[PDB]
């Protein structure tokens, strides 16, 4: 479960030596303390039984070496387990950035009553759903489970939709039909729902037809959906409104955030666990694989490229007579091949079906990226020459066909440079994080309420097309999770009361009313005799509630700044022959 | 002939040159340093074959 971690027998027994000794002497398994020491060193079975009795209800902080942000150290319930490696919950792995290629993670023991109380309340692995960087879920990774859910909530054409165009009395009979094999998981059908099933949020205005008042918001209602969507929704809690759209990765994050906002923590953890189980099961059934026939090179590629080659060699011919300078030939050839690789990328994009495994696991957001499939199937394209140049002859073969010898060499030219750049950037990112944390200390929240009313002007909605109002594209990182200094009246009536953190409903209402800017309170204008007040800083982001007095905002800010330093890894593609520009 | 166990080859192009003694880098260097019989033997072999080589030992 979400708050459990496995400790091998030896490590648990060695960590808890004082406690195992105390428990052994108290139960008279051992005569005296020294004999208890001898018996634990011997490692008799009764010692392991006492250990299983003593670890429970005692938090242990699992902690990885980089510990980039405060989710690095997380408390867990320990649990004896055979073998010699820590067992961990795959949901929390992405919080650590902890892959399973090969990775060691330290275990620390809270000793005092205060320490274990803190690990119970504060550092618990289930009370840290939201990453403090921007206030979004980080504890729903996507490598495998999300593929399962995506395959589960998918429209037709994923297979031959047999058993399509029928209605089933309830999800149970639909499942029975599914085992019978007549129905397939991906097929549109009309499904009933027992009372209490809250319907789709867009289903509310529609209802059944009758001459009497009806309340379909909380009674029976048929619905044209898929059995998969029924399974997905019955993973989510009953009170959660039905979801009738494909989940993928973005919408899964959306619904997880909604759950984290409107529900208690325990329900959030249980829902995540159900989602995990169903995701693994249906990813197993998803049948995603890879084979030689899986990656089909587009047929058109060869033809188009030879056409380009003809043009290219023609250019080469008219360069042999001196009619064009070498620099001009290089530039026009680079442009030609950029055009060629864009065209072949589009052709490959059109060619590959939606049912193939790579499409399923790249569209869903499980793992991968469209240019990676581009250079697995289509030709790689232009590759950077050493010290940031562009070769004249790009690679015309994809990894399925197998690169040539010089092509492989000139690809290594960029690969090794990428490795070295990655290493230098992680070093510099660590240094930057240290500097930010060291300047940013001392800034603790030491006052409930500011003394002042001054605020900061922020643009609520920009790029308003003619005859309409359009909200800012990046409104979330700017104005969300901030407290209004003062109220707003636009029609003479108060719309957004003072000192309320902003969410989707209020932002939509204010945009609809047509206001163009807002006066949001923020730490910059904060006038606090001692540090900074809680309301100026607004709501925390890892908790979704007002920032408690005394929280360490400086350390969280510095860590959030520094965490994606390793992730940036962006550099100018080419100097262009000019320095200082 | 019977140097290695049979292994079906999917190669398409014949290779004129065979891979050299893969450990030549260390053994020949120390042979040269010692200047023992082996280094001078290779020196005279190169000289009669016309190949250049340092004829003074280390």
């Amino acid at each position: 479960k979400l708050h459990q971690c496995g400790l091998p027998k030896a490590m648990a027994l060695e960590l808890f030596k004082p406690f195992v000794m105390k428990r052994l002497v108290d139960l008279n398994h051992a005569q005296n303390i020294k004999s208890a020491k001898r018996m634990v060193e011997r490692g008799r079975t009764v010692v392991y039984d006492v250990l299983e009795e003593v670890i429970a209800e005692h938090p242990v902080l699992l902690n990885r070496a980089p510990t980039l942000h405060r989710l690095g150290i997380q408390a867990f319930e320990p649990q004896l387990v055979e073998g010699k490696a820590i067992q961990i919950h795959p949901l929390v792995c992405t919080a650590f950035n902890a892959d399973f290629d090969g990775d060691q993670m330290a275990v620390h023991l809270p000793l005092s009553a205060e320490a274990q109380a803190e690990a119970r309340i504060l550092m618990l692995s289930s009370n840290n759903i939201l990453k403090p960087a921007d206030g979004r879920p980080v504890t729903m990774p996507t490598q495998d489970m999300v593929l399962g859910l995506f395959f589960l909530t998918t429209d037709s054409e994923g297979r031959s939709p047999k058993g399509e165009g029928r209605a089933f009395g309830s999800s149970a009979e639909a499942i029975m039909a599914f085992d019978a094999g007549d129905l397939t998981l991906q097929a549109k059908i009309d499904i009933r729902f027992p009372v209490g099933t809250i319907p789709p949020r867009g289903f509310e205005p529609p209802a059944r037809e009758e001459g009497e008042p009806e309340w379909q918001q909380g009674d029976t209602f048929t619905l044209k959906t898929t059995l998969g969507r029924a399974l997905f929704n019955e993973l989510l809690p009953e009170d959660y409104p039905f979801v009738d759209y494909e989940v993928g990765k973005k919408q899964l994050s959306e619904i997880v955030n909604d759950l984290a906002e409107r529900y208690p923590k325990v329900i959030v953890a249980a829902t995540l666990d159900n989602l995990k189980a169903a995701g693994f099961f249906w990813a197993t059934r998803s049948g995603v694989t890879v084979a030689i026939s899986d990656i089909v090179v587009p047929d058109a590629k060869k033809e188009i490229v030879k056409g380009y080659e003809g043009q290219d060699e023609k250019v080469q011919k008219q360069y042999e007579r001196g009619l064009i300078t070498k620099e001009e030939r290089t530039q026009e050839l680079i442009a030609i091949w950029t055009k060629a690789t864009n065209e072949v990328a589009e052709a490959m994009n059109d060619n590959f079906p939606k049912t193939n495994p790579v499409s399923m696991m790249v569209n869903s957001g499980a793992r991968g990226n469209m240019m990676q499939m581009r250079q697995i199937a289509g030709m790689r394209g232009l590759v950077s020459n050493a010290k940031n140049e562009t070769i004249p002859r790009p690679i015309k073969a994809s990894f399925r066909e197998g690169l040539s010898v010089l092509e492989y060499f000139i690809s290594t030219h960029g690969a090794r440079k990428g490795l070295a750049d990655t290493a230098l950037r992680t070093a510099d990112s660590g240094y930057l994080t240290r500097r930010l944390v060291d300047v940013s200390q001392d800034v603790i929240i030491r006052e409930e309420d500011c003394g002042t009313e001054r605020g900061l002007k922020l643009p609520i909605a920009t790029r308003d097309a003619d005859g309409t109002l359009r909200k800012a594209e990046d409104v979330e990182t700017s104005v969300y999770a901030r407290m209004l200094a003062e109220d707003v009246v636009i029609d003479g009536k108060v719309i957004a009361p003072a000192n309320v953190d902003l969410g989707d409903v209020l932002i939509d209402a204010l945009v609809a009313h047509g206001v163009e800017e807002v006066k949001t309170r923020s730490i910059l204008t904060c006038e606090s005799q001692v540090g900074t007040c809680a309301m100026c800083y607004g709501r925390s982001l890892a908790t979704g509630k007002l920032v408690d007095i005394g929280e360490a905002v400086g350390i969280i800010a510095a860590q959030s700044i520094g965490e994606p330093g390793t992730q940036l890894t962006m550099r100018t593609f080419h100097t262009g022959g000019v320095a200082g520009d | 002939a019977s140097t290695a166990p049979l292994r079906i080859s999917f190669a398409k192009i014949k290779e004129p040159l065979e891979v050299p003694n893969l450990l030549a880098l260390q053994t020949e260097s120390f042979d040269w340093l010692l200047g023992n019989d082996a280094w001078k033997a290779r020196v005279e072999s190169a000289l009669e074959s016309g190949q250049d080589v340092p004829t003074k030992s280390g």
Partner: protein, 151 residues
């Protein structure tokens, strides 16, 4: 605004997002000090860094005394200079540069008050952030009378 927007677009170029309050705290830290100019009545040196709160305090003292206030212009400097020029010499000494900061701490005979975080991690005392605050740690506990009456 310029710093917030610039750093935010630099981060967004890759695709990562961070909330602007994280940036704003650091930015307020960088702008904290002010360069004093025309240090006639204030009697201290001209053209050196001074904390904003100290500037406001001394200005209030001098205007109350009747002397005209000494001018000041806000000054922005890097995080490193801001960190080094801090009141707690122990925290700065725990930073990258030790010899110079320790040397001027000794020559100035400045006592490091233990308010803040890093220096209270040096000493081993309780950090004044979270469970270490006075108001959270002074509470006393006892059940109700009805709990004892029941048992």
């Amino acid at each position: 605004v310029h710093l917030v927007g610039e750093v935010q677009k630099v981060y967004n170029s890759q695709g990562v997002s961070i909330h602007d309050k994280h940036i704003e705290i650091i930015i307020r830290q960088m702008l904290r000090r002010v360069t004093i100019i025309e240090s006639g009545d204030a009697e201290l040196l001209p053209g050196e860094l001074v904390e904003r709160t100290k500037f406001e305090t001394e200005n209030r003292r001098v205007v109350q005394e009747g002397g005209h206030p000494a001018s000041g212009r806000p000054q922005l400097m890097g995080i490193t200079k801001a960190s080094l020029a801090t009141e707690s010499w122990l925290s700065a000494a725990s930073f990258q540069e030790t010899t110079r900061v320790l040397t001027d701490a000794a020559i100035n005979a400045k006592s490091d008050s233990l308010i803040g975080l890093k220096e209270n991690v040096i000493i081993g005392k309780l950090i004044p952030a979270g469970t270490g605050l006075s108001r959270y740690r002074n509470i006393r506990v006892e059940p109700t009378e009805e709990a004892k009456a029941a048992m």
